[PDB]
Symmetry: C3
Subunit: 105 residues, 3 copies
């Protein structure tokens, strides 16, 4: 009689815990999908809740993670900065040659 009230409580709890477990699994997968969405690049969700590879294009390179794409951008930017540095130096020299010519003619 009274022991039975306890058994029914326990079974009720187990039922609700099983619901909580199913809800937690759904939450995890929803989090996974949100991560795939904010990574972009075609990243998607596997059945094990992991996020599979995006395809990020930088120049003629393809990359499966943000760091490698950022690094490819960074390298290209540095090459451009170097070239800009060279151009600016060349233009300085050209200005000097013109100033010299203008003086002498």
């Amino acid at each position: 009689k009274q022991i039975e009230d306890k058994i029914e409580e326990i079974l009720s709890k187990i039922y609700h815990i099983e619901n909580e477990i199913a809800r937690i699994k759904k939450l995890i997968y929803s989090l996974s999908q949100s991560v795939a969405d904010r990574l972009g690049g075609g990243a998607s969700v596997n059945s094990d809740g992991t996020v599979n590879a995006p395809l990020y294009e930088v120049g003629t390179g393809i990359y499966n993670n943000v760091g490698s794409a950022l690094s490819a951008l960074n390298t290209s930017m540095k090459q451009i900065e170097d070239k800009i540095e060279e151009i600016l130096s060349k233009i300085y020299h050209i200005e000097n040659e013109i100033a010299r010519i203008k003086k002498l003619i």
Copy 2:
């Protein structure tokens, strides 16, 4: 019977422990979400539903809600810059050749 009363109390205690563990797991998921928001940056944050709210990444005059589109905008911008540099190198080529010719005539 005492022994079954006592077993049932132990089971109820086990259930309480399990409920505590489920609560801890939920907190773990939300802490993971927060860390992902932090690592994405761009003002990303955790939704009440545990998902990560979109970042806002600026590239030039665009705003982007995901890393791939932002990388793509940067890659385009970079190509545009490279093409402008090429044009500049051509202008310099011709200017240098003019200056060499002027130097002949003086």
Copy 3:
């Protein structure tokens, strides 16, 4: 039959403990996949969270994607500024060259 009901309860609890262990594994697996997608040395923390990446842009050091993107955006703007300057310098150089050619 109370002992049978207890047996059934303990069985359901066994399964729940298994699903909890499975759930923890899922969380740490997701975290690892996020670390892999971020790159930059990001890793899974003992506590389940993603330890920060390290991204280099220019002379700088960044621990999140947005800051690195912003640093790249700003470097591009700075380059555009230098292009502005170069075009202006070219404008003036060409004008001076044209004037010299009228005078020699």
